[PDB]
Structure formats: C-alpha cells, structure tokens
RNA sequence: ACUCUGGUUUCUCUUCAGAUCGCAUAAAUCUUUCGCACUAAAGAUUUCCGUGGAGAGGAACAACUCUGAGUCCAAUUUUUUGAGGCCUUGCUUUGGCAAGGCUA
C-alpha cells in the first residue's frame, strides 16, 4: 500500500571479488511479483540440478 | 523383370563465405557518450580460438543397396461390328461424289 503509493509518485513526479547486494533486482512490493507460482508440470516434470526427492 | 554413371574414408593445397559462417563467445586499438571506466554503454577496425561451400592434388577399400539413366481385356461404355444392298436430284474427275428417301 505505502509503497505503491510511492512507486506511483516516483513513476508520475578496490578489488570486488563478490557483487554488492545492492545490485539485486526483484525486491518488489506486489505480492504476485514476489510470490510466483511456481510450475508443476503436472507433477511429472522437475526442475534440473535440484535434489529429484526434495 | 536386363545394362552404364555416381562411392565412402583420409591427408594436403586454392578460393568464396554478414550464413546462429560458431544453438558458442575472447582480446587489442580508435572514436563518442556521460561519469569522476574491470567494477560502463554506443560505433568502427584489427587479431585470435575454428568453421562451412566449391575447386584441385595425394592414398585406403567398396564397388551397383541407394540416386538415376539406358531398357492377365470377344457378348451394351470405346479395340473383335449392324455391317452392307435399292431409288432421286446437282455435277459427272462417266470412277462416282453430296443430301434425302429406303430394305435389311
């Protein structure tokens, strides 16, 4: 609510080995942008290098 | 259903390739842009890793699979018959032709 008030005033008015976390994306107030569904494909089809039992 | 090409593999050389030439993805240089350039973008050039097409040469075994080419019908509907014979007129190329009327 607040801040899609605010994302809607926004819209209308040294060697690094690791990256800094400030670069992430996805830090998102609409909760169907956050919380995807996520595929089943019916329940057959799996995602690759994940553990097939978990 | 008979006969004559073309093979495949491998090594090397020549040329073209803006085609995801590569279902992958490096580096350098120059220019521009803004930052203030590994932690950044654009354009161009180059070098690398290594390709396809065609052509040429070498050398190893398969030679006709394939790609081609040259090489059983008499009974309605077609190719196993309704065929041939008589009469008039125009012209006879005096052989008969054309149309009609017929008999079978």
């Given at each position: 609510?607040?801040?899609?008030?605010?994302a809607i005033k926004?819209?209308?008015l040294?060697?690094?080995?690791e990256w800094d976390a400030?670069?992430?994306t996805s830090?998102?107030?609409?909760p169907l942008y956050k919380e995807r569904?996520?595929?089943q494909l019916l329940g057959r089809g799996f995602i690759a290098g994940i553990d097939?039992?978990?």
């Open positions: 609510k607040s801040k899609e008030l605010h926004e819209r209308y040294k060697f690094v080995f400030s670069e992430d830090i998102d107030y609409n569904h996520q595929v097939l039992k978990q």
